[PDB]
Design an enzyme around this catalytic site. Structure first.
Site, PDB file in Angstrom:
ATOM      1  N   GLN A 105       1.244  -0.895  -0.379  1.00  0.00           N
ATOM      2  CA  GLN A 105       0.218   0.059   0.390  1.00  0.00           C
ATOM      3  C   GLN A 105       1.045   1.213   0.284  1.00  0.00           C
ATOM      4  OE1 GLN A 105      -2.490   0.465   3.453  1.00  0.00           O
ATOM      5  NE2 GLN A 105      -4.361   1.618   1.569  1.00  0.00           N
ATOM      6  N   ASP A 108       2.129   1.674  -3.408  1.00  0.00           N
ATOM      7  CA  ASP A 108       1.732   2.195  -4.243  1.00  0.00           C
ATOM      8  C   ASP A 108       1.353   3.855  -4.334  1.00  0.00           C
ATOM      9  OD1 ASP A 108      -1.713   2.510  -4.053  1.00  0.00           O
ATOM     10  OD2 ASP A 108      -1.779   0.704  -5.428  1.00  0.00           O
ATOM     11  N   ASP A 110       3.664   5.730  -3.421  1.00  0.00           N
ATOM     12  CA  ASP A 110       4.828   6.963  -3.658  1.00  0.00           C
ATOM     13  C   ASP A 110       3.909   7.004  -5.393  1.00  0.00           C
ATOM     14  OD1 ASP A 110       7.084   7.372  -4.333  1.00  0.00           O
ATOM     15  OD2 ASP A 110       7.973   6.428  -2.728  1.00  0.00           O
ATOM     16  N   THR A 184       4.052  11.451  -7.847  1.00  0.00           N
ATOM     17  CA  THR A 184       4.944  11.757  -8.843  1.00  0.00           C
ATOM     18  C   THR A 184       5.077   9.784  -9.730  1.00  0.00           C
ATOM     19  OG1 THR A 184       6.985  11.039  -7.216  1.00  0.00           O
ATOM     20  CG2 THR A 184       6.224  13.563  -7.781  1.00  0.00           C
ATOM     21  N   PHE A 186       7.160   8.003 -10.306  1.00  0.00           N
ATOM     22  CA  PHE A 186       8.347   7.821  -9.949  1.00  0.00           C
ATOM     23  C   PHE A 186       8.757   6.971  -8.427  1.00  0.00           C
ATOM     24  CE2 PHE A 186       9.790  10.894 -12.961  1.00  0.00           C
ATOM     25  CZ  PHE A 186       9.932  10.221 -13.771  1.00  0.00           C
ATOM     26  N   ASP A 188       9.637   7.452  -5.609  1.00  0.00           N
ATOM     27  CA  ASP A 188      10.670   8.242  -5.347  1.00  0.00           C
ATOM     28  C   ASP A 188      10.328   9.062  -3.532  1.00  0.00           C
ATOM     29  OD1 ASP A 188       8.847  10.026  -5.485  1.00  0.00           O
ATOM     30  OD2 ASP A 188       9.188  11.741  -7.399  1.00  0.00           O
ATOM     31  N   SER A 190       7.501  10.437  -2.400  1.00  0.00           N
ATOM     32  CA  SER A 190       6.886  11.266  -2.772  1.00  0.00           C
ATOM     33  C   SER A 190       5.713  11.200  -1.348  1.00  0.00           C
ATOM     34  CB  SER A 190       6.027  11.310  -3.686  1.00  0.00           C
ATOM     35  OG  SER A 190       6.031  10.480  -4.432  1.00  0.00           O
ATOM     36  N   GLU A 258      -5.410   6.705   6.352  1.00  0.00           N
ATOM     37  CA  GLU A 258      -6.019   5.976   5.692  1.00  0.00           C
ATOM     38  C   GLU A 258      -6.192   4.721   6.901  1.00  0.00           C
ATOM     39  OE1 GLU A 258      -6.509   2.504   4.287  1.00  0.00           O
ATOM     40  OE2 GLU A 258      -8.310   2.392   3.513  1.00  0.00           O
ATOM     41  N   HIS A 351      -6.236  -5.040  -2.132  1.00  0.00           N
ATOM     42  CA  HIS A 351      -6.842  -5.323  -1.600  1.00  0.00           C
ATOM     43  C   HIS A 351      -7.298  -6.969  -0.725  1.00  0.00           C
ATOM     44  CE1 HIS A 351      -8.270  -1.133  -3.572  1.00  0.00           C
ATOM     45  NE2 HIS A 351      -7.582  -1.145  -2.176  1.00  0.00           N
TER      46      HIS A 351
HETATM   47  C1  HEM Z   1      -6.545  -1.909   5.074  1.00  0.00           C
HETATM   48  C2  HEM Z   1      -5.650  -2.183   4.121  1.00  0.00           C
HETATM   49  C3  HEM Z   1      -6.480  -0.880   2.832  1.00  0.00           C
HETATM   50  C4  HEM Z   1      -6.967   0.250   2.492  1.00  0.00           C
HETATM   51  C5  HEM Z   1      -8.527   0.288   3.653  1.00  0.00           C
HETATM   52  C6  HEM Z   1      -7.421   0.999   1.026  1.00  0.00           C
HETATM   53  C7  HEM Z   1      -8.412   1.534   0.898  1.00  0.00           C
HETATM   54  C8  HEM Z   1      -8.534   1.929  -0.320  1.00  0.00           C
HETATM   55  C9  HEM Z   1      -9.141   2.559  -0.867  1.00  0.00           C
HETATM   56  C10 HEM Z   1     -10.689   3.411  -0.079  1.00  0.00           C
HETATM   57  C11 HEM Z   1      -9.280   3.363  -2.592  1.00  0.00           C
HETATM   58  C12 HEM Z   1      -9.782   3.905  -2.872  1.00  0.00           C
HETATM   59  C13 HEM Z   1     -11.200   3.552  -4.527  1.00  0.00           C
HETATM   60  C14 HEM Z   1     -11.607   4.062  -4.999  1.00  0.00           C
HETATM   61  O1  HEM Z   1     -11.822   5.332  -4.862  1.00  0.00           O
HETATM   62  O2  HEM Z   1     -11.610   4.155  -6.251  1.00  0.00           O
HETATM   63  C15 HEM Z   1      -7.919   2.875  -2.269  1.00  0.00           C
HETATM   64  C16 HEM Z   1      -7.287   2.231  -3.934  1.00  0.00           C
HETATM   65  C17 HEM Z   1      -6.091   1.934  -3.775  1.00  0.00           C
HETATM   66  N1  HEM Z   1      -5.424   0.485  -2.849  1.00  0.00           N
HETATM   67 FE1  HEM Z   1      -6.233   0.387  -1.542  1.00  0.00          FE
HETATM   68  N2  HEM Z   1      -6.054   0.047   0.412  1.00  0.00           N
HETATM   69  C18 HEM Z   1      -5.674  -0.635   1.309  1.00  0.00           C
HETATM   70  C19 HEM Z   1      -4.653  -1.267   0.967  1.00  0.00           C
HETATM   71  C20 HEM Z   1      -4.229  -1.328  -0.247  1.00  0.00           C
HETATM   72  C21 HEM Z   1      -3.224  -2.689  -1.099  1.00  0.00           C
HETATM   73  C22 HEM Z   1      -2.484  -3.254   0.382  1.00  0.00           C
HETATM   74  C23 HEM Z   1      -2.549  -1.625  -1.983  1.00  0.00           C
HETATM   75  C24 HEM Z   1      -1.459  -2.600  -2.531  1.00  0.00           C
HETATM   76  C25 HEM Z   1      -0.641  -3.618  -2.271  1.00  0.00           C
HETATM   77  C26 HEM Z   1      -3.881  -1.511  -2.592  1.00  0.00           C
HETATM   78  C27 HEM Z   1      -3.376  -0.051  -2.885  1.00  0.00           C
HETATM   79  C28 HEM Z   1      -4.698   0.526  -3.899  1.00  0.00           C
HETATM   80  C29 HEM Z   1      -4.113   1.681  -5.277  1.00  0.00           C
HETATM   81  C30 HEM Z   1      -2.765   1.370  -6.488  1.00  0.00           C
HETATM   82  C31 HEM Z   1      -5.185   1.796  -5.486  1.00  0.00           C
HETATM   83  C32 HEM Z   1      -5.683   2.950  -6.387  1.00  0.00           C
HETATM   84  C33 HEM Z   1      -4.359   4.008  -5.644  1.00  0.00           C
HETATM   85  C34 HEM Z   1      -5.142   5.068  -6.877  1.00  0.00           C
HETATM   86  O3  HEM Z   1      -4.385   5.183  -7.994  1.00  0.00           O
HETATM   87  O4  HEM Z   1      -5.319   5.874  -6.890  1.00  0.00           O
HETATM   88  N3  HEM Z   1      -3.813  -0.696  -1.182  1.00  0.00           N
HETATM   89  N4  HEM Z   1      -7.449   1.655  -1.543  1.00  0.00           N
HETATM   90 CA   LIG Z   2       6.331   9.065  -6.166  1.00  0.00          CA
END
Ligand code: HEM
Ligand SMILES: [Ca+2]
Ligand SMILES: *[C@@H]1O[C@H](CO)[C@@H](O)[C@H](O)[C@H]1NC(C)=O
Ligand SMILES: *[C@@H]1O[C@H](CO)[C@@H](O)[C@H](O)[C@H]1NC(C)=O
Ligand SMILES: *[C@@H]1O[C@H](CO)[C@@H](O)[C@H](O)[C@H]1NC(C)=O
Ligand SMILES: *[C@@H]1O[C@H](CO)[C@@H](O)[C@H](O)[C@H]1NC(C)=O
Length: 595
Positions: A105, A108, A110, A184, A186, A188, A190, A258, A351
């Site tokens: 997370q 992700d 970053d 960003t 990268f 990095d 951020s 969060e 997730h």
């Molecule tokens: C308790 C743990 C976590 C919570 C509560 C959480 C919660 C959320 C929430 C609310 C979103 C926004 C969803 C939307 O409106 O589309 C989200 C997006 C995201 N989650 Fe999680 N998540 C968790 C764990 C993780 C983990 C472990 C990863 C990766 C290993 C991750 C990767 C992401 C990514 C890539 C996004 C999209 C971000 C973006 O570019 O906007 N999440 N998550």
């Molecule tokens: Ca970054």
């Protein structure tokens, strides 16, 4: 063109020559094309966007229309029939600590954030969306299917607001909507420093010329720092316990609070920056505030890259690691370093790795107190459990001794997230992350499962029989086709996560490809990649090689016993060693003298 104001940031920069440091926004990293990978630009599209009207309307929007001739299933029905389960017994990942989920997370955040439009929407729009479940403009509500339990307690829908996007400009040419990446691309750090310059400055301690980041002045954790509070009213972190009224943290990324273990890792990273700046100010008393900050920043950045590429991705990608991310051969400025829109869905494989509880553990790694084990749902936007209830040491011990959830084809996402998610602009622990992910795929114009299969050079099943074979599961394939009708219409988030995992990794073939490609590109396309000749001296590099997550904990908490391989499942005391047994970052190579 019609005339609804869009999401709108502020882009490009003029480029320092031999600056040995990254910009905050990511600009100027690529010299030939300086905005590549910068924050507040469009997510890249590897494939053309797929919208109901070709431009912006999501599949699922209009009732008598179809996607390839079939209706698309309600996001919440997919969630209920495919993604949900009751029994947590046996779901844990026997060979991954909870840190594995948590580092994901972190990485992700970053790399990507597609901001949403709710906060900035009118009160009317918000009310129409939540109260009345009325589809229109930014409101794309997630409707409950018949017989959903939530019909008895939460009305007809969960509200949902579309992602912000790049504004139609002159020339005015008709082009598909692109969502923004606000951080960003990268890798990095951020998420610590910010991706926008006024924020980055506000986070800094400019009151002393010591290059420190600002720390909380109201609370400390046994003498160790916390992030500053974000002191807006109203605050969701205050809302979840008004008697405690402990605000969310202020960090380089707005999602830092969060959940409590995310805030815990943010806290470690911040502490590490100040540790580094103090150790460099000792070694180089002559360095001023800027140089200390930048040099600390640069090292923290490298730490993130090393842990991510050496420790984390090999255990995500398994046998596919080498295939997508072969040994580095140096910066290639023809590589696109931008995060793609699809990757922001692919990386949500995380997730399914999140378990139902979080534990506080004492110094013998036993349950810490009478409320040792907490349900995850109570920890969303929860800082008071940190500040008023033991600080981060007991959470850090849980990160190490507890396990991640294992993705399972009939136990995908814990109900702590699938039924009890708390969203910061709303009042209930009753949202469904899985539904939201599916809805969001559609919001973002995702091509379907088979489009991505073909992009990755993989077979594209068309029938029940073909899909059964790809998923190695007849029932799952059955349920997916009963909902979706053709595999072409399966939303990328669920299709990719449905595939059995590759050998030794934690994702299937499709995801391995989308993730592997992206990570290859963010390494190969980054001028300031830590291994890129000239970024660090070779002595600096040989020290950096020794970093580990365990040492980060040793250096920035009072946890005195740790494992060597913090991402592996590790049981106390057999797998745990004293911190003197763990390599340190040797900073002599940063000694800058005059002669
Ligand atoms: C308790 C743990 C976590 C919570 C509560 C959480 C919660 C959320 C929430 C609310 C979103 C926004 C969803 C939307 O409106 O589309 C989200 C997006 C995201 N989650 Fe999680 N998540 C968790 C764990 C993780 C983990 C472990 C990863 C990766 C290993 C991750 C990767 C992401 C990514 C890539 C996004 C999209 C971000 C973006 O570019 O906007 N999440 N998550
Ligand atoms: Ca970054
Ligand atoms: C767990 O996975 C790691 C890869 O980090 C491997 O070295 C370790 O021996 C594995 N053990 C089992 C039983 O899977
Ligand atoms: C800034 O640094 C000084 C030490 O130079 C410290 O006393 C002060 O609390 C710091 N301020 C913040 C906001 O961290
Ligand atoms: C709220 O926090 C207070 C004060 O920190 C704590 O004593 C109490 O148990 C908490 N109540 C709830 C319902 O979380
Ligand atoms: C840089 O990237 C492109 C596209 O992947 C490739 O064709 C070219 O071989 C690369 N350049 C070098 C020097 O490897």
């Amino acid at each position: 063109s019609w005339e609804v104001g869009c999401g709108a940031p502020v882009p490009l920069v003029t480029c320092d020559e031999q600056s040995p440091y990254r910009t905050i926004t990511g600009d100027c990293n690529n010299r030939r094309s300086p905005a590549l990978g910068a924050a507040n630009r469009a997510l890249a599209r590897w494939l053309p966007a797929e919208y109901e009207d070709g431009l912006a309307v999501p599949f699922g929007w209009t009732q008598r229309k179809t996607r390839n001739g079939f209706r698309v299933p309600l996001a919440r029905e997919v969630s209920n029939k495919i993604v949900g389960y009751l029994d947590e017994e046996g779901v844990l990942d026997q060979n991954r600590s909870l840190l594995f989920m948590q580092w994901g997370q972190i990485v992700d955040h970053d790399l990507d954030f597609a901001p949403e439009t709710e906060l900035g929407s009118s009160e009317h729009s918000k009310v129409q969306c939540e109260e009345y479940c009325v589809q229109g403009d930014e409101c794309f509500p997630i409707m409950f299917p018949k017989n959903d339990p939530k019909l008895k307690t939460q009305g007809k829908c969960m509200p949902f607001f579309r992602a912000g996007f790049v504004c139609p400009t002159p020339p005015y040419q008709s082009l598909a909507r692109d969502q923004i990446n606000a951080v960003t691309s990268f890798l990095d750090a951020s998420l610590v420093y910010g991706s926008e310059p006024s924020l980055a400055s506000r986070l800094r301690n400019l009151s002393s010329p010591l290059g420190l980041m600002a720390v909380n002045q109201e609370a400390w954790d046994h003498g160790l720092a916390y992030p500053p509070f974000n002191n807006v009213k109203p605050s969701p972190c205050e809302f979840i316990n008004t008697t405690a009224h402990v605000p969310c943290f202020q960090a380089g990324d707005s999602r830092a609070s969060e959940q409590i273990l995310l805030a815990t890792v943010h806290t470690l990273l911040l502490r590490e920056h100040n540790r580094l700046a103090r150790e460099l100010k000792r070694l180089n008393p002559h360095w001023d505030g800027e140089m200390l900050y930048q040099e600390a920043r640069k090292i923290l950045g490298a730490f993130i890259q090393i842990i991510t590429f050496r420790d984390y991705l090999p255990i995500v990608l398994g046998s596919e690691m080498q295939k997508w991310i072969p040994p580095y051969q140096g910066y290639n400025n023809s590589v696109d370093p931008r995060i793609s829109n699809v990757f922001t869905f692919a990386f949500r494989f995380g997730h399914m790795e999140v378990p139902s509880t979080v534990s506080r553990l004492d110094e013998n790694y036993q349950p810490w107190g009478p409320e040792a084990e907490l349900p995850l749902h109570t920890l969303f936007f929860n800082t008071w459990r940190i500040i008023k209830d033991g600080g981060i040491d007991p959470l850090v011990r849980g990160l190490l001794a507890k396990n991640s959830k294992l993705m399972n084809q009939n136990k995908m996402v814990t109900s702590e997230l699938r039924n009890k998610l708390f969203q910061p602009t709303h009042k209930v622990h009753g949202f469904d992350l899985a539904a939201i992910n599916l809805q969001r795929c559609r919001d973002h114009g995702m091509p379907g499962y088979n489009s991505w299969r073909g992009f990755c050079g993989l077979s594209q099943p068309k029938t029940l029989k073909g899909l059964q074979a790809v998923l190695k599961n007849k029932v799952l394939a059955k349920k997916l086709l009963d909902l979706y009708k053709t595999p072409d219409n399966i939303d990328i988030w669920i299709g990719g996560n449905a595939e059995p995992m590759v050998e030794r990794g934690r994702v299937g073939p499709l995801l391995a490809c989308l993730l592997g490609r992206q990570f290859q590109q963010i390494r190969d396309g980054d001028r300031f990649w830590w291994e890129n000749p000239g970024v660090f001296t070779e002595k600096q590099r040989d020290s950096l090689q020794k970093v580990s997550f365990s040492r980060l904990i040793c250096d920035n908490t009072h946890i005195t016993k740790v494992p060597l391989h913090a991402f592996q499942a590790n049981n106390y005391p057999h797998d745990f060693v004293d911190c003197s047994a763990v390599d340190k970052l040797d900073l002599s190579p940063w000694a800058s003298r005059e002669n």
